[PDB]
Each structure stands twice: as C-alpha cells, then as structure tokens.
Design a protein around this nucleic acid. Structure first.
Lengths: 150, 129, 174, 46, 50
RNA sequence: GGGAUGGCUUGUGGCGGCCAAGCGUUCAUAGCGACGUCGCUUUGAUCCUUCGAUGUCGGCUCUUCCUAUCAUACC
RNA sequence: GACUAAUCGAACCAUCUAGUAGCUGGUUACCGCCGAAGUUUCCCUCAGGAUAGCAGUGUCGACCUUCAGUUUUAUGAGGUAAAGCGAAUGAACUUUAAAUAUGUAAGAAGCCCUUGUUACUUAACUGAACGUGGGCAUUCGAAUGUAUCGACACUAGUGGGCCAUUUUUGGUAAGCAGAACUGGCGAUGCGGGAUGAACCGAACGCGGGGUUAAGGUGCCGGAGUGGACGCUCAUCAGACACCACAAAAGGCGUUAGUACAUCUUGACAGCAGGACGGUGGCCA
RNA sequence: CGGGACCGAGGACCGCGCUCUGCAAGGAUGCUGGCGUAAUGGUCACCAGCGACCCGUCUUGAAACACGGACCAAGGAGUCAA
C-alpha cells in the first residue's frame, strides 16, 4: 500500500454544455477547434462561456454596452455570450458592432436603427478568429433574487 | 514595563505562585496582546486540536508576562540584508543574503606529537581502587 | 556475540575558541563492525568523560589484528556484568588463539552460564597470561599439564542426515 | 484565567475579569443589607 | 504511524514500502531522517549504487 | 416494548510501642525491616444478661467424582 | 366486582376509522466513482437540545494567490543533567551547557526614513496610531515537499462509544477512578500468534513470475533431526514469559563466581593416645 | 563464461543508436514433428488435497442474548396532490 494523505481531484468545471441545442453543439465544435488551433485567450474564454448555464449567463443590456463603449472603445467589436436586452431608459443608442449569443427583438431593432451591426458568434468567428479589437462583456451575475436570498 | 495591543508576549509563571495553579498549559506559551489593564493583560493563544487550530483567550497578571523576541532575528536580517546589498552594489561584488543550513564538516588532519591519546577503560581504575 | 573484531577507536571533542586542541581518547572495542564500534565508543565516552556525539568527532578507527594467531594462548578476562542484584566483578579464563576468539567465547559462556546478554556485560581487561603459573582456573590448569594425552570414548560417527536407513549397526569406537 | 470571547466583547471598557467576583459579592451584600434595613424599619414601627 | 513521522515520510516522498530517495546531508535533513528512523534504513551510497 | 467477582479461595486478630539479622546511609544518620516481644481485649466459676430474615432452604429417588481420612489396612 | 348468550373494573353490532405510537417487525436488479463520525462551543437537568468538526454532488472565479500536524535558524518554556570551582561565589554555585517533545517568528502583501494631525498618550513634537511623500528588484532574502487553490449552492450521517501506549491527578486490603494527546476499532479483507473485538506483520481490481515481513524449518506442515560453546533430569520438567501465589522463603540438587580465612611452622577428614592439679570452688 | 524458470504487450515506415554490405538499436521470429479429432477446449456428476459458522433483524463500542425463518407459487411496502 501507498500512503496518500492528499487526494487527486476530479475536474470541478463544465467540459461540455448540458443543453441539447444542436446549433449550440455546432458552435461548441467550432470554438473547440479555434481554442485548440489558436493561441488567442479570447477563444478559450468564449468556449468556456458557451459551456455555461443560464444563471451563469446573465443578460447584458444596451445601456451597459453603451457604458463600456466610452473612453476609446467606440470602434471595438462587443462580444457577449448571453442575451442582449433592450433598455428603454436609454433614449439614444450609439452606433455599435455587437456579437451576441442571442438578441431580443427590440434590442436588435434599436441597434440596427442606430446604424450598428448585430452578429452571431459564428460570424464573429469568421471575422475575428483571434478576437482582435474586441470588448468582452458579462452581465451582473449576482443580480438575482436567489443570490440576494443567499 | 507597559504593554500595547498587538505586542507579542511570552507567559512564564514564576516562583511559588506556580503551585496548584489551575492552568499549567499556558505556561511557556507566546501570544499577542488584545487587552491591557494596569495589573493584567489579555493574550490570544492558539491550541491545536486534531487538524485545526482553535483560539483561546487568557488574562495574565503582568508579573508572569515578558515581551518576546520572536521577530527580532527577522528584523535584524532585513536590516543587514539591506545594508549588505547596498555595500555590494557600491563595490560591484555579489554577496550571500540567504541563510543556509549547517554543512557536513570537511577533511582535515590532527597531529599527535604533543597530544598523545589517553587509553580509556569502560570503568576508570581510579574509581576501582 | 557474533564474528567480532577488535578496533582501536580514537575520538575527541570538537575544537572551540577556548580549546583549540582538545584531548584525544582511545579505546579498544570488540564489535562486529565499525558502526557498532563507533557507537560503543560514544556510549562509553558519554558514561565517562561526558563528551557527546554531537559535540565530538571520530579521529580514527583501525583494526587491531592478532600478532600470532597460530599460537595457543591462555587469556584472563576481567569483566563486570549486570543482573537483578546489580553489578558483579568476574575473572574468567579462556584457552584460545586470539583475543577476539577469547571475547567471543566469553560472550557465549556468559550467555550460557548466567544469561548475561551483550549490553549487560562490560569488558574491563583482556590479558594474555605470560606464564603457566599465572593460570588460576582448574579447567585451564588440567589442559596445560605436562604430556597431556587423552582418548575419545564413545564417538558417534558422522552419518549424513539424508541417508535414512542403514544396513549395519554403527560403532562408537573411532 | 481563561475568559470567554463573548463575555470579553460584552465587557465594559476599562473593566477586568479580575473584579467580577467582587462585583457579585457587592451585589449580594447590597441586597442583604436592603432586606435587613426593611426588617429594622418594620420592627421599629411595631 | 504518528502524525509527525507520517508528515516527514510524506515530505521525504517515502509513501510506499521499499521506496528510496536521495538526500543531500544538511542539519535540516539529518534531523528529519533521525526522527523517521523507526521506519527507514539509510546510508552513504557509492558510485556503483548511484 | 425492553430484560432476567473468577488461575477468586484455605491455619493462625486488630491497633500501639519496643527489639531486631539485614536493606539503605555513611558531606544528611534519616528512613524501610523478617524473626519476635509487651500492652488492651474462674483456685476447675456462673447457670438471675439467648442482642433484629432485604438475601432461603429442603426432602425423595439415583449415579458419579474429589480428598481436605470418620472407620477398616499398613507405618 | 359476581352475572347480563364460551364476550364484563363495563356486553354485542356497524360507523367515525386507513384513529394515534416517539415502540416492535419489514421495506424488492446490477456495476462504477467518492466516503464518515462520539463534550468543539453554548445554553436548568433528566423523559434535553442546538452547534463546530468530519462527507457527497453541482458549479463559478485569473483553479489568482502558494501553502505544510516536518526539520533548520533566532528566541521563549523545560536551567533540568552535565563540566569547573589551578573562573568568581556558594536544585537553590555559575564562564558554558542537557535528552524528550513544545510555543512564537522567518518579506516587496515586506522593511525603514520623512512629513504633518491626534479626538490616544507623553514633562514634552515625546512614543504610538492615523494619513502623506520617499528610499529600497542586484540577488525576493532557511530546508524539504507541493494533481494539496478559493468561494458559493444544495444534500447526509454522526456529533458525552470501546480498547491500548505515553503523560498527569487522585486512590484501594487488593482491585482501580478521572483527565490530555496519539493509535486502533465500530466500517476491514490478507499472513502469522493451534483457536479468538483489542497481539505482531501488512492494508485488498483480475492473473503469471520473482523476493520478503511477522512467524517458522522432528512429524502432523512448506522449510534443518543445520552449525558453535555451555546449562538443565523435574513422582505429570520445559518449550508465548512477564501478574499472583511469594518471603530478607525452604533445598546434604547441579554448575559458575565474589569476599574473608586456614595450610609442609602440616590445613580440612579420620585413626592412636592425652583430656590433668587447687577442687567434692560458693550457696542450696 | 555457463545452467534454469515465466513472459512475447505492439502491428507499414518514421526515433535514439551501434560492432554500419548489416544489427541483439521505439515489445518473436525462424526451422521441424505428430494429429486434424472429441486429441486440445467446455459442461455435468463424483472422488481427492487445501480452504470455508446460518441467514435476516436488534443492541451497544462491540459480541453474546433475544426475535423471525418446514417448503413452493402468486401478491407484497417512500406514492399522489397542493
């Protein structure tokens, strides 16, 4: 016998989505290829967020995007791996290029009416395969009723 | 000698007052002062049970407490390392700034001419006579 | 106790600023090997001069071989041994060809006759008896007698233990 | 003297655990003398 | 095995019976091996052994 | 629903003092101590002082074992 | 407290009703991955509770920062042995200094310097705290190890059990009773102790070969009627003893020793002889 | 320099090399014989050597006690709603 006071630890993170969405499976295959064959850390972070559950992908609003588009970020491509929602408190939407997992109808309409562009993540993979000149944004994780109750 | 909160002190019960004392455990222990009164001080000590440490708090009369020299060597080495490194940068030569453990002894030769060895029996014969 | 050798072990206290040249101490140790010899040296030095192993060093270890291993000699051994009563002096004699053979015979003898194990026995002196008149024990005196000659009655012949059966009854006359 | 952390936290500033037994003794004596003075007053009224 | 010899054997990477390691002799290592002597055999290896 | 001290024991008291071969000790002369001993516990008397069941034993029939032997045998 | 249809300290029948039980019994395929626990701390106890600790599944965060039942180093506790007193003085003497484990500390997240304030404190702009700025990366300032991170969420058993070593406190006629650490067991198979909760070795996927541990090698039984020197003869020896019987015990059993003593000026054992006179000493 | 045992995982080449026409260098090939069927292999019954307590429950720390079990078939116990 061998004395092993320490214990080998199995992985405590997701390695695959629990979702059965076929298009998400295709996206996961594409970003597995990109994070294996490139050196860009952007692709690895994107792959990990594609694995995540919905409470780990809180929505990002247009006012949050407009806040982060200030101070030299007006030309960077915004990348969100969750839903982008509309904020009707934001009366003037700036021009922006946003790639998201999905958009709400009003958010897509307001971005296109302001003159920006909405992209899917596979179009993002085509145009920026190394994540150059991008702004990777997350929504508020702890802004949940249960997390308040913790 | 007055103490302050945060000072490190040793606990040593002295003399005949260590007779039938209810707490023999804290004698010879070292801790940090959290509370000071004129005749007694409050010390945080840690007792280590199974895998974990737990915190104990004791009140010690001043005559059984001295300030400790726990950090004195570390502070002295920090000062000497600073001044040695400054002198080394001035003179353009490297110097050793880390302690090392004691090494095994090296080879040497011992003369016999004025130091002839004395043969010893397991019992000295002077004691036998 | 075992195939012993005699070692000269010389050791000293580690030199200091007050004592740059400490005194050297020599003992003769009967031991199976050098590790045991040095351990016994430090044991006796701790018992005598209060010099510890950590504060001292071994200067020399040498093997003392018998000068004439082909010459039959008589040996007197003065020893002390420890029992439930305490420590007892003993003088005994052995007829051997070397000091190491005498000391091994002493250890087997003390074990057989008094159950005295190795660590309860302190060997104090091993001397070669120079003259026949120096022999005191009758079990050596009968061996040093003039014109000594004896027969060997009732000798069991050496038969291999693997030969179970014999066709003739053996004889005990040679 | 081992002291409880909760008791030391609830302890007033400047006070020590070395006077707690004298505090309890002073409280008990005060109650006893109050009862004694009440008995003396009633006996004087009678 | 008591916890201090168990810890010293772990720090010497001697976790299984008949495991062997090389140790450079300093005081900080010699005292450790002195403590775990009821479980180990050690000595000074020659070039052929190495 | 839950339950149903032990290789013990045997023949010679306790307490207190003394003695004591020995064990210790011999810069302290203390302490332990077998074998013993001494104190307390009616001229063959009196018969006018019986001192508390919580604790349970028996008998019949019949067999065998121990010896710590009452008898028989030898000494 | 008898009887009232084999039913009576309250008949029989149906219903409420699948009444309630904390008590008893039982509770249904397989393989794989992990895997425990017994005063820690608080509360009025028994017909008591929580709770720490120890576990498993999910995640998430830069799985960033390193940390560690270990040694070393400085310094405490244990000054306690020891050496000397041709050092002083006299365990309480000290130049020096034990073993055993043991506390605290050992960096850039650090060390200082300077600036001021203070509602602390100090005789005091004095210390300290609070901030401010600066200097220090020339080595990042012991060793060894490091699939050992952290935070949430949810779920579960056990949370004043047994034995033992060591240490410590009390005791008895003898037993023993409390604590503290550690190990084992409850949850655990294997080899050996003939046998077995507490002993020794060793921890476990299915197989082949090799080598061992504890324990063994006269037969049962794998392996030696193996080698060396001695000891012992028991009218139920002894072979796994240590405790008790049990004592400073009893032995004309047998060996090995120590001390004292005698001895050719003849010891020790014997044999041949002497063993006397005052004197039938005094009293009775 | 001999003597013996157990084993042959992998499946084009690639590598490290060497004693370099080639090799013992990132895992066995070459040569030969008998047989081609119950011969090897397997199942069942039995003998032999060694091994091996009767399950479940309960209790405590554990055993022991105690409780249930003559045998077989079918039925038989964490469900549904808020």
């Amino acid at each position: 016998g061998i004395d092993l006071r320490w214990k080998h630890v199995r992985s405590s993170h997701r390695k695959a989505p629990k979702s059965d969405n076929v298009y998400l499976k295709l996206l996961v295959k594409l970003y597995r290829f990109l994070a294996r064959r490139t050196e860009a850390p952007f692709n690895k972070v994107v792959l990990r967020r594609l694995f995540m559950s919905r409470i780990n992908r809180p929505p990002v609003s247009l006012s949050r995007i407009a806040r982060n588009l200030k101070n030299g970020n007006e030309k960077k491509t915004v990348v969100v791996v969750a839903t982008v929602t509309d904020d009707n408190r934001l009366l003037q939407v700036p021009k922006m290029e946003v790639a998201a997992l999905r958009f709400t109808a009003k958010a897509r309409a307001r971005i296109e009416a302001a003159g920006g562009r909405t992209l899917t993540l596979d179009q993002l993979a085509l145009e920026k395969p190394t994540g150059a000149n991008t702004l990777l944004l997350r929504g508020p994780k702890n802004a949940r009723e249960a997390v308040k109750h913790f | 000698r007055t103490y302050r909160v945060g000072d490190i002190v040793d606990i040593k019960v002295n003399g005949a007052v260590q007779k039938g004392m209810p707490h023999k455990f804290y004698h010879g222990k070292t801790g940090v002062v959290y509370n000071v009164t004129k005749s007694a001080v409050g010390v945080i000590v840690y007792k280590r049970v199974k895998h974990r440490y737990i915190e104990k708090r004791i009140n010690v009369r001043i005559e059984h407490v001295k300030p400790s020299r726990s950090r004195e060597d570390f502070l002295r080495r920090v000062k000497e390392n600073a001044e040695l490194k400054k002198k080394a940068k001035a003179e353009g030569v490297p110097v050793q700034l880390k302690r090392q453990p004691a090494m095994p002894r090296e080879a040497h030769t011992v003369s016999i001419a004025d130091n002839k060895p004395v043969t010893l029996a397991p019992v000295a014969y002077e004691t036998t006579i | 106790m075992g195939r012993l050798q005699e070692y000269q072990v010389i050791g000293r206290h580690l030199p200091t600023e007050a004592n740059p040249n400490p005194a050297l101490y020599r003992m003769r140790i009967f031991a199976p090997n050098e590790v045991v010899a040095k351990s016994r040296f430090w044991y006796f030095l701790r018992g005598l001069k209060k010099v510890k192993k950590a504060t001292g060093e071994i200067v020399s270890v040498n093997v003392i071989s018998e000068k004439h291993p082909l010459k039959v000699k008589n040996f007197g051994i003065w020893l002390r041994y420890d029992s439930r009563s305490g420590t007892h002096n003993m003088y005994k004699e052995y007829r051997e060809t070397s000091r190491v053979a005498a000391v091994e015979a002493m250890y087997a003898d003390m074990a057989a006759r008094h159950r005295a194990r190795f660590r309860s026995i302190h060997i104090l002196k091993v001397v070669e008896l120079e003259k026949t008149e120096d022999v005191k024990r009758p079990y050596i005196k009968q061996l040093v007698a003039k014109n000594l000659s004896f027969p060997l009655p009732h000798r069991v012949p050496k038969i291999s233990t693997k030969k179970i059966f014999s066709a003739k009854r053996p004889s005990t006359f040679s | 003297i081992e002291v409880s952390a909760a008791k030391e936290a609830m302890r007033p500033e400047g006070t020590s655990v070395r006077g707690d037994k004298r505090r309890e003794i002073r409280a008990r004596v005060k109650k006893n003398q109050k009862q004694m003075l009440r008995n003396q007053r009633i006996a004087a009224e009678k | 095995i008591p916890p201090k010899p168990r810890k010293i054997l772990q720090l010497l990477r001697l976790r299984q019976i008949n495991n062997g390691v090389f140790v450079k002799v300093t005081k900080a290592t010699a005292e450790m091996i002195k403590i775990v002597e009821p479980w180990v055999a050690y000595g000074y290896p020659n070039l052929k052994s190495v």
